[PDB]
Amino acid sequence: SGFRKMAFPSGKVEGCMVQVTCGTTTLNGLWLDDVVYCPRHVICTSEDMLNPNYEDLLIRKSNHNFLVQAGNVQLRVIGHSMQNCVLKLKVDTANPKTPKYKFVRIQPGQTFSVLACYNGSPSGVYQCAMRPNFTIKGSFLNGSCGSVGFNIDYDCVSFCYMHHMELPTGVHAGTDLEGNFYGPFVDRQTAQAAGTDTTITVNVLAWLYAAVINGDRWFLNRFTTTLNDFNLVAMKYNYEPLTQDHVDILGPLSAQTGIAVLDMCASLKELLQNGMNGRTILGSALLEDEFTPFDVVRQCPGV
Amino acid sequence: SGFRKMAFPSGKVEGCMVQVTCGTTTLNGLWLDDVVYCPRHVICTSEDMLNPNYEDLLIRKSNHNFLVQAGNVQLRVIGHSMQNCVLKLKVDTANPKTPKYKFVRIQPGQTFSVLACYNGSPSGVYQCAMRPNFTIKGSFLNGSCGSVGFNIDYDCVSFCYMHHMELPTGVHAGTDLEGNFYGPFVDRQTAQAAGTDTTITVNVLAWLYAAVINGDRWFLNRFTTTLNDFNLVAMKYNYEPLTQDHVDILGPLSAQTGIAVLDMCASLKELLQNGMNGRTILGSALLEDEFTPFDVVRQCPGV
């Protein structure tokens, strides 16, 4: 038993991390087959980042201007191109450690593991949710650009995130592996607004189900509610509106615990209106929203 | 910036996990050099676990009764012995993926990464603290026995924990890699008391320092205190007593932030006496105690 925020084992991804240097900017790249992926602002000076013209800057870079280091061995760069906000460096050698992989663009509220890296070396691994405003609340210190977020399905690694930016508010922004930013953000050092950071309602619900399964039951109440009546409450508390698709994906959790999804919604409603009274749920003193229903089910073998 | 609970990259440990079967009991083993380490209760039936005589049970096992599977290939068992509560299976083949490693017995309040495994396959990775009562609050579902806890120092893996038991209260107990239990626990299915689960004061302090460094400053107060006067408060709230060694290890955090350790103690005292008033610190609505000072410093490059 027990329930923990848990990242996927990072070994398949560790073997793909490289160091990419252009001029005096060094960050992390991802080495899959004979292509190295990294943030295009590897080509920028600190002054360039205030307002860069990436096309003009890249014009002045040749293959030999990109230094790519996997551990201590050289990769020879035989080609480069810019796909949206990522650079694709063609190298002379296929990574022998390349796993089965796909590139995925994930949906807001979905979760993934981040392998925080520094200078091409993995430093740590932790679980992240893509917030509804398309930021993540990570731990990205200097030199962590190019670190990636991924999910693993048996032996297939789905890369979904590459770290690019910290916004002036201290949250983090980045792209999928085709270089398209999540959210309205740009790789420029300017003030950028994340909208309201609303709570991922379907995830809080799944986590309450996890709590019940693990024997935390105090918040279970005597009320039920309706979808619209809950959403009326959800909107006041900046909760994502709940939809019948969300109800559907909670079905197996509802079936295991015998608690109808709308009864759990009514318990959540009372928690939002009354607070938690200094109690905890699964060791937390607030409502956790970075576990998807799939995350919960992976840790509840009864489902 | 940002601050996250973060485990070490698990790749060096993934390559050492194997599946160990004896009779119809299957759990995880750790394959280092030509020896496989696993919980000795792999040899027990469910009925045996109520009150096992491990010596008598092992008498009836030969080398060929232990089935060891690394992925899909066989390991040939050429010897077995019982070191305290672990079995050491000598196999015919040195693991080619064996990293540099040591066996360490960790101190209460120290932290480590757990690679949760099932049937020899890594499932996830998360950070744990050894509680002062020598339990951990993990996520260990059926078949996770033998999963290990470790720390990594550049390229050296320090194994410190092997999972053995869930106590009837839902917390977890286990051994070091010489098979000596942490705490007073035994590998028998009986009621076993963990004492009072006190809070790791020095860790809460380090995490408050991390909060300051990350710009969470509201709880900083105008008071200072004394070691004995703080401990007087600590004891009432079941906090571990603070010692001059603890003050010493917080020194670099005190130096970076300019906040004397006893001023931070006074801020903590006010938090314990007044609560957090529905505010958060580093996104948490309670005081976190599973970050050591070393953990914090690894994520605060200014220290």
Numbering used by the authors:
A (entry chain A), B (entry chain A): 1 to 303
Paper text:
The coronavirus 3C-like protease (3CLpro), also known as main protease (Mpro), plays a crucial role in processing two polyproteins (pp1a and pp1ab) encoded by the virus RNA genome. Inhibiting the catalytic activity of 3CLpro has been proven to be an effective strategy to block coronavirus replication. In this study, we have identified mutations in SARS-CoV-2 3CLpro that confer resistance to WU-04. To understand how these mutations affect the WU-04 sensitivity and the catalytic activity of 3CLpro, we solved the crystal structures of these mutants and aligned them with the crystal structure of the WT 3CLpro.
The S301P mutation, which is far from the WU-04-binding pocket, indirectly affects WU-04 binding by restricting the rotation of 3CLpro’s C-terminal tail and impeding 3CLpro dimerization. Residue S301 is located at the end of the last α-helix of 3CLpro. It precedes the C-terminal tail (residues 301–306), which is involved in 3CLpro homodimerization. When S301 is mutated to a proline residue, the Φ angle of P301 is fixed. Consequently, the C-terminal tail cannot be rotated and is restricted to a conformation that cannot contribute to the homo-dimerization of 3CLpro. This finding indicates that the S301P mutation destabilizes the homodimers of 3CLpro. The S301P mutant showed a significantly decreased dimerization ability (Kd = 17.81 ± 7.32 nM) compared to the WT 3CLpro (Kd = 0.94 ± 0.21 nM). The ΔG value changed from –124.75 kcal/mol with the WT system to –103.90 kcal/mol with the S301P system, indicating that the 3CLpro homodimer is destabilized by the S301P mutation. Compared to the M49K and M165V mutations, the S301P mutation had a moderate effect on the binding affinity between 3CLpro and WU-04 and only caused a slight increase in the IC50 of WU-04. Conformational changes in the three regions are also observed in the crystal structure of the M49K/M165V double mutant, but not in the crystal structure of the M165V mutant or that of the S301P mutant.
